[PDB]
Amino acid sequence: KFYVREPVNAKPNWLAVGLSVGASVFMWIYLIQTHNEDVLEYKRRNGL
């Protein structure tokens, strides 16, 4: 409304925000899963 030229970032790029947030949560989930799996494997290999 204010800018004579509509700003390039006028509105959120909903595809971009969704991709970013989904990737972030996916990375966190995968990381915690791998940490648990690796702890279990370490204990198995070293006899607790």
Partner 1 sequence: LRYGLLAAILGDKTTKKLHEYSRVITVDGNICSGKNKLAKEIAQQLGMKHYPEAGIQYSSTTTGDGRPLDIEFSGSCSLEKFYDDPKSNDGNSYRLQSWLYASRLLQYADALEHLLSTGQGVVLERSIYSDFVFLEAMYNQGYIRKQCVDHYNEIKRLTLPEYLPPHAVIYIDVPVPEVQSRIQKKGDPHEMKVTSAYLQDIENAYKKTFLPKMSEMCEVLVYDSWEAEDPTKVVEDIEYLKYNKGPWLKQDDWTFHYLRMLVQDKTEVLNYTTIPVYLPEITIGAHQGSRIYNSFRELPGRKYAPGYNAEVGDKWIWLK
Task: Report the interface residues with partner 1, using CB under 8 A.
Answer: 1-5, 7-12, 17
Q: How many CA atoms lie within 13 A of 5 on its CB side?
A: 3
**Closest CB 18 distance from partner 1, rounded Å:** 10
In the complex with partner 1, the residue whose CB is nearer, 3 or 46, is 3
* Helix locations, 1-48, DSSP H: 14-45
Q: Name the minimum Å distance from CB 48 to partner 1.
A: 46
Pull the structure tokens for residue 13.
Answer: 């790029």
Q: Residue 32 has which token pair?
A: 């915690």
- Residue closer to partner 1 (CB basis): 3 or 47: 3
